[PDB]
Amino acid sequence: KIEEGKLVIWINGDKGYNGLAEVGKKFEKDTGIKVTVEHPDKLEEKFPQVAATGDGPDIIFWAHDRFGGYAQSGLLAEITPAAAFQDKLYPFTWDAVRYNGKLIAYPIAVEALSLIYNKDLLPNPPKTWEEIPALDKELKAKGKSALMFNLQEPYFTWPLIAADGGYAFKYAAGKYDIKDVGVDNAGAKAGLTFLVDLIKNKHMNADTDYSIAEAAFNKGETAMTINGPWAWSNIDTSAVNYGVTVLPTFKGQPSKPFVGVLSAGINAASPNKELAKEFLENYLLTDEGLEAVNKDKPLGAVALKSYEEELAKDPRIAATMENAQKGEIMPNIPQMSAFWYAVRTAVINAASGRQTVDEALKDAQTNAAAVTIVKPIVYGNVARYFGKKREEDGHTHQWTVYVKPYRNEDMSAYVKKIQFKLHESYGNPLRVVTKPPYEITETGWGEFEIIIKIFFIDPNERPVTLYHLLKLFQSAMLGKKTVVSEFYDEMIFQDPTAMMQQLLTT
């Protein structure tokens, strides 16, 4: 469970979590409510896996692209900012956090990648990707390199891939078409081919990650990096005099960075929704709160009009907005995680020779379009100990073995029947339930494996089989209290029929 009377906030370790901690103390000084800020690794993965079972933080911070998928999986409370509060942020930022006409997060700040150049090593930054090899040669002469950035995260390579016609999903008729992916067009191939040729020609190194690229640029070892506003603090700390500028063009085209809106969502499972609204609207999303975060790690172009205007004069923020303007706002649709996973695969493989560009992107094109629907379920048994052992048969317990949907939905929409196979010591051990609740009540003396087979109204949709050890004895101060052994799992429907997609989606 999420502890009440406290706020737990998750934010990525590249963002100003110390400055958020300061807003945290401010909130605690005022309200007596303890705020704890954590930066767990792979939180874009950790939040959905914990929040699935109603655990994790009260507040989750990530780029808005993940939030449609979070809200789709029921992981987010719809936020209730008054009209007055909405006027204080840019309408553009609210759009990034609107899924199915519902606001599902508080926008914080607009992030785009820029080219970051050591002004000493390189007074005049390259206007093109193409001139970079010749620059890395002139610089390899002096024991330097031209360019190092994170090749492990497709976010950083995507601007190049998008430059000559790569796209995620083509927007049309007021929605993104998840069948029309632009990952394996001539544009996308030319961009990823150029990245691969930079590696093959030792202008760059395929294992270069965030830490290596950053550490390299901040020690003055590499003339350029590609990174977002958050990276500026560590460069400020370093001796490096740096410019933030427009990304190089590729084949004469602007590099097109995916534009993220750093967004703050409230956990659906939070007992502290009012406290999270208070903290976000009235402490964080103020000039004082954003300054406290921004001075730790720059946010970019903040959603809050008042503070955006104060910061707008900074040329690093103008370059960010220039790159953003050449880029595309990321969709927030659930399919973005599939797209990102697919392109991470293609870029890493291609970059490390494991695949060619054409294989990698052909694979990524198919993976980015792959519809995966998730039905979270709970299954197991409740078992109530009788007053005393019935001697007739020797049974000690009444038990119910069950499968139910995790979230209160109508499982019968797509489930035709659930079969529970009991031990041979039961007559008609193959018990079938065609209608909810999907459960069998029985009496017995023993624990045995029950096999549970779930059937779908589309019979082509392969049945799911579960294994449950019926439990009667937990063994623990609980006495006549009903013993519980239930488990959360997720049923996964990969590219199901439109019939099945319809019943699977309420």
């Binding site: 031990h423 041979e424 003396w445 023993g446 045995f448």
Partner: peptide, 8 residues
């Protein structure tokens, strides 16, 4: 004879 179990 499938495995059933109880503690007594």
């Amino acid at each position: 004879a499938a495995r059933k179990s109880a503690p007594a």
